Design a protein around this ligand. Structure first.
Ligand SMILES: Cc1ncc(Cn2nnc(CCOP(=O)(O)OP(=O)(O)O)c2C)c(N)n1
Ligand SMILES: Cc1ncc(Cn2nnc(CCOP(=O)(O)OP(=O)(O)O)c2C)c(N)n1
Ligand SMILES: Cc1ncc(Cn2nnc(CCOP(=O)(O)OP(=O)(O)O)c2C)c(N)n1
Ligand SMILES: [Mg+2]
Ligand SMILES: [Mg+2]
Ligand SMILES: [Mg+2]
Lengths: 565, 566, 565
């Protein structure tokens, strides 16, 4: 039979979780005990609650969903930052918080970890701002319905949800869970709408021969990556990805022309998009970053807007049309529109100019790091790319089909990459997992590397030590862009703690030349027992051309005077 | 000199006594930070992450009375909210300022970086309202002066944190100039008739109750009533005990001080004395599940005089608008001697708190030996920051020379608070001997802020208690979740130093596995005036205070009590 | 082509609305103009915004959904009371509010109708507490998605939603609406769950022969009224309705045993429910009123809980199982369980004792009113029954199959009945519409009768004038239960205003004896041009036995001392 806690544990197992992440607190200890009863998933502990949230977020990138368990208030509030992030990045992360004994409500009790007033409804209220569903469970009888509701909602909407459970009901009996299939049950496309949206799209492109396809960062959330390839092959048009959609489309596909990112697009792409008679945008997010400071906004008159659950085409909005069904059906009826792809080729714009192997003993430069990392990419690889110049370095890399890039470009919380890489590596241990993180970002969440050591995960970490916040320097410079340098490589033996209570097998290495980097990378690949951090030394100014160009536009957008009135 | 939204804020902060403000840069606040840097009367101090930034400000407020933290929209503010809730719980006026979207982006259908991906940016304000005494968003320059003044006045009056957000494009725009600083501290005075009636009712109440005990609460400092409490205690000549979270809010060398009142983990004799008292005068107390030892130690309502910072309940009458400082002062002038409870305490011959004697220097280090050596470091110029964990209980057992301070975060109780709080405190009180007692588990949440101690060359002495896990949690309810990955904590110091890298540092990391190693480590720490010293102390998990074990069982029982029926 | 306003108007027409309700205000005047452009529905004006909301609420009871349009703040806030009520009663009412010019946001402007601060986000925030979805529209481009989202949500959840529209965008162009079918698109039951829920139900009742069916007040929201009859006929068990579900099951059906309402149940019903081995509850709401002050709570060990979208049976919870599918599938596989019905019959408990025709010239008594109203019931009739003794009078009435009763027993806002009867009558003009309202309730919303006169609706109103709040008196008595008496009958010629600017055809009559009532009823039926108010005079103490019994239990529940921490 089930308890509130084991009911939750089963539902989490049913949606495919093999792990959940946690930080203990007296308001959740019994809950954690009940979760441990289900042997079909492991309980993974984190350093702090912000990292715990981001670890779950990374896990969701690998496995589709995730769960984080924290304690009331002191745990939940910081975790909310990671949950907001999961919301921004369309990931079904389930945050569960311990909560006060249910006897303490409406009793005039001040409790530890709370604000010092006698009510405990505020945490729930805060959570409602950053989740698709949020439920508080005060009695065992209520648990099943509330658990099922937030989980179904998380899976359907691809957004995080919130649960809190009174600490004294976690072991109390409740109903048992029905079949897992109930949790994935979703509406199908409305047939009449699906067909009308496809027909209207055909009418729209009837006499527009240069059709371009723009791949957006919600393509995965729509589960429409495979259908986009089918559509692209049938169309035979030009396909470009928005920056945050890197790896959401096969880069070896003959129709792929590279990154569309305004004035920092791949060669030829910017012109091709400008020349296109029609742009079919697949689940895009157009924000101030992705439009390069509002300088690159798609022409409304040329745009077919295909969202995950609706299509706007030919001046008509079609709700209840799922992107996957739309792309698949379209691929069956659409005819060849090679116009934009032919135009692209006729530009002879060339490939992205990349640097050649540097002199091994020469001082390390940014391009040389990017080159060697790119040469590590296999169809089995995932690159977690942190906010900072790593965004742009990663964007310039050619991906073998199957290789993945993970970006957090909507939330853009520096430090995300470290615990996300941990969570991801736990969820996809079979992959070659690479983390590209700047020194500034690493300092926010560095400790979670110790958990990589703990669980013996072979994450390869490229710590770019350019002594400060370079992306920030390229937006607007000041003393606040300077940081205290660490001996990052030396941090590894600290987290190992060899000769202490336990042990570890992480490695820390320094790379000041191309040759040192190459040797470091060999050591990293041979290290199967723990993470390897490679501390790369480059100058602050030594960054991509793209960052500098993009940075100026971003700063301009941010600072534009107020308009009148 | 004319003002901008940014320099108006900077001046107000300087006017309330800030010599520093804490920040983490983000594109939504870069220009704001530039404007704050224009005022040379305070420094801009940078933090590793926003949670640490908030707790650094929180620690600074403990040293200087108020503080400010500046973060970026959404990704910065949300984690900082945890520290701001903490400031609320601990009654500290921390001002959180967040950068915000360009004011052209509102009601425009724009998706912005760092936000949820909808086109609305009101949610952060809404969340902030839950954990502050005031929260204001500034979208135009004209609105800035009123909203800045309002949240600052509120923070200072209520002794609670407040929230401001400023559109990133208005930080340099002109606005009115600030008037006199005195306007910011302007508060109502006690209502005279009420003040007198509360004092007279108190005298009537204790007329035929000779055993009067004074219970010092953790809001005594927030009420600014520490000094007046001593005056009242000396006039009364009764027994004075402090609640756990009030440690150091009353002079421990005062002849009336009988020690800690904390239920079954009170100092010897104190529990009985409080039970026997005919009247208990509670000065600004917080009675919660922790401070009542799992609801086992609750003051007798029929014996209680409840003197809160701004009201008094006495003799079955509530008197609002009576400030604790005035009440204590007015009372010290009229009250007569009530030595009953103090005489009773002495007659118990309950003795002093039994403390261990100097251990054999080469013998394996034990918890009591650490506590002994730390206690021997206490001077009238010392402050101990004591982390949630057994360090609560070790610190509680220490005798304080008059003037020595202990800082507790026992209401919020966010493990890891101690590290950035000690940083912020040390920035605000560099003249003091600053000691940090933090467990290994807590240290891992916020460890990086030690790098900022190294950066600003702050001589904080850190006792890292390495008992390999969450011992306080183990003593509440044990499971695999209480185990952590051990670090080489001492070695973390040379990492944050980064000597031979881009800059340098003068922190020191040392290990102590015996009393003798600890003693030598402490010498090195005191001689290190150029950076923090972390002393990694090795003890066993079960090697903790008796008090923690007793208190832990009661807490677990309270937490787990079955539901009652409608 | 469409504007923000005409897009909304079309969506409303697409979901079946033939009317929408409004109160003009400068923030919504242009919006109202755009709604008037769609000739497929009428714009109906109300006296005040509270009545406007309840009119829409009553319309939803007739047509399945409804819409109310009000002005910013001064209009919306009172209307929120009616929207909360629609939420409590599971009705898809769409509230649309005018809002400030979109130039006034983040501008430091104080605006008329607002709080006097410079921000206008508070109304939206308040609305979120009482709706299933709430969206503010500040630009035309955003309108289509936000409109579609709240309407789909209202229809799926059967809950009200909220929209606000900047006053200056109502005429601005936006995309056009796709097919209406997209708005009704909903997930189907999860097959595995549906089958498992049915099989578990069969196992549960395998060796429990006395099976009783308890019909709940969410049966209509689940669209499962018809399927419940099919299941009941197959089962051949005893069927009782909870008070608020009156008319949600055919009372001429051989299996119907009457009202189950604790100690105020129909004769024999209370015992039958106590004796049942299994109780199958179809979409019930168990609250402090419906359990008669927590005195009548179903035995958890006997209960099969069939909610609109889930089933809890045999200690297992099955989400994603729609009540309609569950009942239908169940009716195909279940075998005869006549146990509880046989037991009921064997009680020889008799019919509900009703009074016989009173002496026509004798002073009017409550029972005589109830008798004559009951005799007016036809398969084409709807009785709107107000909170008060009218609840209990209506509950005692035998319904010909097809006759409807409308209750607001969850919200229970006195005065709801008057504007609800207006809205209902507008939506179902073909029915004989009867309103049973007490004098105290009538005073809250009396003016909406003028709108019945205005639109020439033949609503028959029984105004029960017992000079005060009798239901309240029977709960707990005090001076606050006394009201100022009106000449209610005379109110009709006031609303007619004959000899003034316009005219009216309402009638007001008094009934102080059975004979006067009978004659009054004849005049009411012959009056096809306007409402007829029949003012019935009875004593304060002359109420149903049920109200007195139920009232005591309710008072006891309300006043029970606090249990200790
Ligand atoms: C939680 C949070 N706080 C601040 C920011 C603003 N921000 N964005 N990028 C940065 C600096 C980037 O630092 P690094 O990791 O060293 O990147 P690079 O120097 O460009 O290789 C900041 C401070 C942010 N995006 N998220
Ligand atoms: C942010 C936050 N997360 C979790 C908790 C719960 N908690 N309280 N105390 C602990 C364990 C602390 O262990 P240490 O710091 O090593 O101290 P010791 O008791 O001396 O072992 C936890 C995990 C908390 N109080 N705050
Ligand atoms: C808006 C609102 N305000 C107050 C109430 C409380 N209330 N509930 N029933 C009543 C009295 C009912 O008055 P009447 O219509 O005369 O009903 P009867 O006299 O029992 O036929 C009150 C005053 C309520 N249910 N709703
Ligand atoms: Mg850097
Ligand atoms: Mg420890
Ligand atoms: Mg009445």
């Amino acid at each position: 039979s089930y308890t509130v806690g084991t009911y939750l544990a089963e539902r989490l197992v049913q949606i495919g979780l093999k792990h959940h992440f946690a930080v203990a607190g007296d308001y959740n200890l019994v809950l954690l005990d009940n979760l441990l009863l289900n042997k079909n998933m492991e309980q993974v502990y984190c350093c702090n609650e912000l990292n715990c949230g981001f670890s779950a977020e990374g896990y969701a990138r690998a496995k589709g969903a995730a769960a984080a368990v924290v304690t009331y208030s002191v745990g939940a509030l910081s975790a909310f930052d990671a949950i907001g992030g999961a919301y921004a990045e369309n990931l079904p992360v389930i945050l569960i918080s311990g909560a006060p004994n249910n006897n303490d409500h409406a009793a005039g009790h001040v409790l530890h970890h709370a604000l010092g007033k006698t009510d405990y409804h505020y945490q729930l209220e805060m959570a409602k701002n950053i989740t698709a569903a949020a439920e508080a469970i005060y009695t065992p009888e209520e648990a099943p319905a509330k658990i099922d509701h937030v989980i179904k909602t998380a899976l359907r909407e691809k957004k995080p949800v919130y649960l809190e459970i009174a600490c004294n009901i976690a072991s109390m009996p409740c109903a048992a869970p029905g079949p897992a299939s109930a949790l994935f049950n979703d509406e199908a496309s409305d047939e009449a709408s699906l067909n009308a949206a496809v027909e209207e799209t055909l009418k729209f492109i009837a006499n527009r021969d240069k059709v371009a396809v723009l791949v957006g960062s919600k393509l995965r959330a729509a589960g429409a990556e495979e259908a986009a390839v089918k559509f692209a092959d049938a169309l035979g048009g030009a396909v470009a990805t928005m920056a945050a959609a890197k790896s959401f489309f096969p880069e070896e596909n003959p129709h792929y022309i590279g990154t569309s990112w305004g004035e920092v697009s791949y060669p030829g792409v910017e012109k091709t998009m400008k020349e296109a008679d029609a742009v079919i945008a697949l689940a895009p997010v157009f924000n101030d970053y992705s439009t390069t400071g509002w300088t690159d906004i798609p022409d409304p008159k040329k745009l077919v807007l295909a969202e995950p659950r609706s299509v706007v085409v030919n001046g008509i909005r079609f709700p209840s049309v799922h992107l996957k069904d739309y792309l698949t059906r379209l691929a069956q009826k659409v005819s060849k529109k090679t116009g934009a792809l032919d135009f692209f080729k006729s530009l002879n714009a060339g490939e992205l100019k990349k640097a050649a192997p540097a002199d091994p003993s020469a001082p390390l430069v940014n391009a040389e790091i990017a080159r060697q990392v790119e040469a590590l990419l296999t169809p089995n690889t995932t690159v977690i790319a942190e906010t900072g110049d790593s965004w742009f370095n990663a964007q310039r890399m050619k991906l073998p089909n199957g290789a993945r890039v993970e970006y957090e470009m909507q939330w853009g919380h520096i430090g995300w990459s470290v615990p996300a890489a941990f969570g991801y590596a736990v969820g996809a241990p079979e992959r070659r997992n690479i983390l590209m993180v700047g020194d500034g970002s690493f300092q926010l969440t560095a400790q979670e590397v110790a958990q990589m050591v703990r669980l013996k995960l072979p994450v390869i970490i490229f710590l770019i030590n350019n002594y400060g916040y370079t992306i920030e320097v390229m937006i607007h410079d000041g003393p606040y862009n300077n940081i205290k340098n660490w001996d990052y490589a030396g941090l590894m033996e600290v987290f190992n703690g060899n000769g202490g209570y336990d042990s570890g097998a992480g490695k820390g290495l320094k790379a000041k030349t191309g040759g040192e980097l190459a040797e470091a990378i060999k050591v990293a690949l041979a290290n199967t027992d723990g993470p390897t951090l490679i501390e790369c030394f480059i100058g602050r100014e030594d960054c991509t051309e793209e960052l500098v160009k993009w940075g100026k536009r971003v700063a301009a957008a941010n600072s534009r005077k107020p308009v009148n009135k």
